[PDB]
Design a protein around this ligand. Structure first.
Ligand SMILES: OC[C@H]1O[C@H](O)[C@@H](O)[C@@H](O)[C@@H]1O
Lengths: 41, 106, 247, 301, 68, 101, 41, 41, 106
């Protein structure tokens, strides 16, 4: 299975999303974006 | 045809082109004007950044603010100055590079 | 194969709309779900294109333009991947190859939008010359021209892919080596280091490096979640600020 | 005091604010869209063709913020220019000062809210709906995103117009330094965590495959039959005996012996050094793709 | 005898640890000793990670002490 | 500093061990055994607790910390380190002879 | 197996070295030696 | 099994105490009580 | 029958009863006396707590010290005052609520 980020994986015939990894990606992106936006004012 | 050369630079490096003389002269003039402003002089970080920019302009080069520090410093100075900014800083706001791509947080 | 004149025109229009919203970025016609679903609806391949749009939107959640740093252009990825999936047949089973090719298309679109944003400077200079005369009409006209050019940036590759018909598209879809796909996946998994490097360089000082090291080491504990790490970081920042204000 | 901006002009400005990023050059990012947005207002307020040109040149200066949080700045600018057209002594410095002092913090607060908080959640919901074949996903995304965007822009523009630079003097000061400091600390912490966990640099090759001794593997040949054999196998696995007679060690295992995520940290530091050396990020991204392909071809990744 | 000698040899290192700690122990650095001892119970943390944590803690403490 | 002796060996109840006697045959039996082990069921009908387990219930490395502190106190009392090393060897030998280590 | 330090173990007929434990011992000795040497100046 | 606190569990026919959980409960109660008593002076 | 109403209150809420006038008047008198004590005035936390109590008493209400702060503050003042306490603080020691039940630490 090939990883494509945000919990998205694909075989040679099917693609799917890992919900836990997607949620973790969203949370981490949220925290990092908030920190970088507030640190750059 | 200078725009195509600038696009090639932006896709390859920073400062690899001629750094056309009119922009350099304007940057030098505005930095000299700003460094003679007592309110600006009271601000040490802004003075340091303007000195760096003027040093780059003296060698016909544009400052590559890869840390993205100059514009937040100008904003801080403007806020501390009762939300007022001299024209020199307004004209110098468009004198840095600010890297042009990134990959996202995920 | 079945794309008639009307469907070709509709595809070109959807590509132009996605390109325009790539820079406007208000109605979000450039998002993978919207763009891929519109391509499917105009071409008649609604369900596979909707699935591809959902998958690519999941991939492209964090593609944000911040300041002058431009994200990898979800518009071109979406439009080109949807068009190639439609042209290649194998509708629902062809999503994997479209997803594989989407990310390099995203990087190519990022390069194209960097070029177009560079050329926008001449338009802005012409608008300055207009403003020196108080001409509102010329400024409006050149703003419209800039928007049109940015939309054409995406509208042209779609027209080229349509010109290079379904035959070559299928022949390159089938002749794609597996090692190329796996290497592209590995590279895409490694790309995020560039954005991390840019952000760190933005906020790196010798007084905050210890917190970076502590976070890096504490992330090796797999039983700690990201919310827990964020809470630890917030608490450490609060304690540091409290111990610093009294000094 | 005779010159007043009606609700029609404010609605026209709010509608034209969609084209804020129409040009977006690299030197004065949103200056052209900012000037285009204000054209109805400056057209009603100024008439002599020197006031028009002066206002245009004034508003073609550098502008950049989040395209949605520019609405309160637009409203404050509308109020200030309405006052200036009436004879009030707001000459040139107050307008640019308000613009510059608002564009920074507003962008820094609006990027996390819209780019990294609302958009990821709504897009995740829409993608989850759409991958399951439901057409409701894109419809929900479009409707929710556009409703939120237009409502926020309209109400913030009206609040800014009815405030009129009061909000500027009301807040902002030394608090932005403490906020920046705390945000920098939290950002360094979370970026260390993200470099450890999300930068995927995995190495395939094995460095050693030794044949382990008699007493260290389960030795399935000499094992009981039935449930007794299963119990013996589970007990021996719990004691730490290897499931095979060979112990394979990979390069990734050796790297994790020092600390997990070492290669990711090294790659991130190398990217930082390359960015410091004026290497464009797009070249680095393409090079990372090429390195991934080559390392896959060489069985290193 | 061989097994007892092995056990004793495995216990010997406490003497060197005791000498080093006695050399470098004050009541202001004992909390760091306790934190390191407790954090070493997490088996998933390596020695380089613990050393990096200790270096970062020392740097933070020095930074917060110089302004006082 | 590891302690061998066991302090208690209780017979755990019917529902807490796998009960290999009542188990399916073939791959089904293997699956059932793996599932029961994942649920936390003991591999045996007796639960053996060692002194080391009781010590680690408080905190791992407690005996090592105590030995280090005792060595620190002995060094403070002008006891030569070579005497302490020889004594540690002797203690190891004796504790092995007494089944304590 | 009898442990002899630095990842060295010996049976009644054979001696061997655990490479991971040896590496950990080297790293820990390095860190402790650096810290004790710099603290004792 | 129904949990009743301090490591005490009961079936429909038998009650028992988990010694490890009981020890942890005692230790945690001790620490929390000491901290709350000293903080409340 | 006021004790039964007080028990019902203590089982239901705080301050839901009449808060009989004699206790309120006593609290007002002792708070006024204590706020005119220079040693008490030198203690800022005790002054703040006494002011809160007096504001509550002015509205015929009893302070609900759910944080359990008043009595430790009085003890701190007494310790700092060479183990001596004015009569007003002694009488006010019985003027707070101090929530009446809890669950234990385990
Ligand atoms: O950083 C604020 C703002 O900066 C630029 O104008 C663009 O990248 C926007 O997408 C972004 O929101």
């Amino acid at each position: 299975a090939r990883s494509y980020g945000n919990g998205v994986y694909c075989n040679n015939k099917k693609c799917w999303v890992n919900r836990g990894e997607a949620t973790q990606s969203i949370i981490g992106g949220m925290i990092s974006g908030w920190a970088s936006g507030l640190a750059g004012m | 045809t200078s725009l195509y050369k600038k696009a090639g630079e932006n896709l390859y490096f920073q400062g690899s082109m001629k750094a056309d003389y009119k922009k350099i002269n304007s940057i030098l003039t505005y930095t000299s004007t700003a460094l003679k402003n007592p309110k600006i002089i009271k601000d040490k970080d802004l003075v340091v950044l303007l000195t760096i920019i003027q040093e780059e302009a003296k060698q016909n080069r544009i400052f590559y603010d890869y840390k993205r520090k100059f514009r937040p410093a100008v904003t801080r100075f403007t806020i501390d100055n009762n939300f007022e900014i001299p024209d020199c800083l307004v004209k110098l706001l468009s004198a840095v590079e600010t890297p042009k791509a990134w990959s996202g947080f995920s | 194969m079945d794309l008639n004149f009307i469907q070709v025109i509709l595809v070109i229009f959807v590509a132009f709309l996605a390109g325009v919203e790539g820079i406007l970025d208000q109605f979000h016609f450039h998002q993978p779900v919207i763009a891929c679903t519109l391509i499917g609806l105009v071409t008649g391949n609604l369900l596979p294109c909707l699935i591809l749009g959902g998958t690519l939107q999941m991939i492209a959640l964090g593609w944000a333009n911040v300041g002058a740093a431009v994200a990898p252009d979800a518009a071109l990825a979406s439009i080109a991947s949807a068009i190639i999936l439609v042209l290649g047949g194998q509708g629902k089973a062809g999503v994997t190859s479209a997803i594989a090719i989407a990310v390099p298309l995203a990087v190519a679109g990022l390069l194209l939008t960097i070029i177009v944003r560079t050329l926008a400077t001449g338009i802005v200079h012409i608008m300055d010359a207009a403003a020196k005369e108080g001409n509102f009409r010329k400024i409006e006209m050149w703003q419209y021209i800039a928007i049109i050019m940015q939309g054409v940036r995406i509208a042209i590759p779609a027209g080229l892919i349509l010109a290079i018909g379904a035959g070559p598209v299928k022949e390159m879809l089938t002749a794609m080596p597996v090692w190329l796909t796996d290497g592209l996946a590995i590279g895409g998994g490694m790309v995020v280091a560039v954005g991390y490097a840019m952000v760190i360089n933005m906020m790196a000082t010798k007084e905050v490096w210890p917190f970076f090291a502590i976070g890096f080491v504490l992330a090796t504990i797999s039983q700690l979640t990201l919310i827990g790490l964020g809470a630890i970081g917030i608490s450490l920042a609060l304690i540091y600020l409290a111990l610093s204000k009294q000094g | 005091e005779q010159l007043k901006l009606t609700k029609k002009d404010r609605i026209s400005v709010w509608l034209r604010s969609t084209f804020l990023q129409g040009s977006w050059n690299y030197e004065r990012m949103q200056n052209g869209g900012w000037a285009y947005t204000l054209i109805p207002a400056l057209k009603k307020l100024y008439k002599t063709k020197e006031d028009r040109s002066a206002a245009l040149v004034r508003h073609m200066e550098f502008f950049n913020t989040h395209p949605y949080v520019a609405a309160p700045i637009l409203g404050v600018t509308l109020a200030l220019e309405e006052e200036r057209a009436n004879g009030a002594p707001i000459d040139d410095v107050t307008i640019q000062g308000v613009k510059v002092g608002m564009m920074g913090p507003l962008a820094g607060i609006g990027d996390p809210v819209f780019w990294f908080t609302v958009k990821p959640i709504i897009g995740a919901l829409a993608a989850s709906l759409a991958m399951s074949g439901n057409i409701l996903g894109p419809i929900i995304y479009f409707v929710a995103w556009n409703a939120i965007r237009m409502a926020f822009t309209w109400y913030t523009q009206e609040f800014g117009y009815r405030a009129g630079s009061k909000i500027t003097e009301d807040l902002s000061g030394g608090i932005l330094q403490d906020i920046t400091k705390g945000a920098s600390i939290l950002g360094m912490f979370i970026l260390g965590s993200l470099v450890n966990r999300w930068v995927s640099v995995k190495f395939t090759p094995t460095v050693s495959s030794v044949k382990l001794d008699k007493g260290a593997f389960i030795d399935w040949d000499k094992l009981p039959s039935g449930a007794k054999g299963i119990q013996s196998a589970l007990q021996q696995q719990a004691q730490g005996l290897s499931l095979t007679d060979h112990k394979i060690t990979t390069l990734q295992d050796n790297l994790d012996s020092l600390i997990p995520g070492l290669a990711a940290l090294g790659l991130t530091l190398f990217c930082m050094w390359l960015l410091k050396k004026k290497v464009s990020p797009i070249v680095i991204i393409l090079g990372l793709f090429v390195v991934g392909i080559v390392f896959h071809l060489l069985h290193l990744m």
